[PDB]
Amino acid sequence: AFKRAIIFTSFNGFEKVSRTEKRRLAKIINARVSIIDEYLRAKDTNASLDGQYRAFLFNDESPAMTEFLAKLKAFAESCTGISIDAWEIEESEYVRLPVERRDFLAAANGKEIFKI
Amino acid sequence: GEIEKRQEENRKDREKAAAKFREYFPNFVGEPKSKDILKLRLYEQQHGKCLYSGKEINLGRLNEKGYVEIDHALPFSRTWDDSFNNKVLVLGSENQNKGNQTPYEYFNGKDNSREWQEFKARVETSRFPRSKKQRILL
Numbered sequence A: 001a002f003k004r005a006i007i008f009t010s011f012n013g014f015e016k017v018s019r020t021e022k023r024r025l026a027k028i029i030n031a032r033v034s035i036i037d038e039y040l041r042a043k044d045t046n047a048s049l050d051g052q053y054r055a056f057l058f059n060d061e062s063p064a065m066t067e068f069l070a071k072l073k074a075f076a077e078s079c080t081g082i083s084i085d086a087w088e089i090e091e092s093e094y095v096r097l098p099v100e101r102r103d104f105l106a107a108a109n110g111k112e113i114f115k116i
Numbered sequence B: 001g002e003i004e005k006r007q008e009e010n011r012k013d014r015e016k017a018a019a020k021f022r023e024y025f026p027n028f029v030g031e032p033k034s035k036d037i038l039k040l041r042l043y044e045q046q047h048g049k050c051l052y053s054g055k056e057i058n059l060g061r062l063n064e065k066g067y068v069e070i071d072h073a074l075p076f077s078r079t080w081d082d083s084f085n086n087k088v089l090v091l092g093s094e095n096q097n098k099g100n101q102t103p104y105e106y107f108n109g110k111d112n113s114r115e116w117q118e119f120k121a122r123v124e125t126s127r128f129p130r131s132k133k134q135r136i137l138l
Helices: A019-030 A035-040 A064-078 A102-109 B002-024 B034-045 B114-125 B130-136
Strands: A002-011 A052-059 A082-090 A111-115 B068-072 B087-091
Touching (some): A035 B002, A064 A082
Antiparallel strands (some): A002 A082, A082 A111
């Protein structure tokens, strides 16, 4: 079945996240990004990563979704000031939501996977 | 080298894109062609919706003949040949009355119809290149 991994990354705490933590996050993200979903591309910056939702399309018949989620979670767990919250939502429900604030709404409307 | 560099960058882009395509569509026969990838990219760029009707596209059926099609939003009277990028994804059952009209024409732009307004809203919240958005809206 088609699903979206909804991911929300936020920089908690004033003990700023290092530039290399940002780089590591942007790389885990960009591993899933292709020309199909070029908009999802991440940079190692506040503007690109802090308080941003990203919605990653998966066919869950593939082990890919779980591998991706596993990497993000392990990564957040190694960090002190990068919080990651993850939800799943079925694609048929996702594409039915409004375009405006879609991912925020998918996050309110989906099943929560984890929050670190 | 510059040609060779470009070749190799384009192979990498396309392998990455094909890989996702195969993940999504494990029962699809053959390697995806450029047009198959393009249906998927326009599906994403249009937030999963037919650009003319605003109807949801069943991604499961994306490769079904008849179901969705790539159309030229404009006839060749506004693009001699290939000066555009104005390819849009539309459901099969929503693009027959259009003929050779532009979207402005077809959707009653001069009257500022509510359906013109909706079409315009779908174009502008799309992820199409800025220039594509403009071409499409006459």
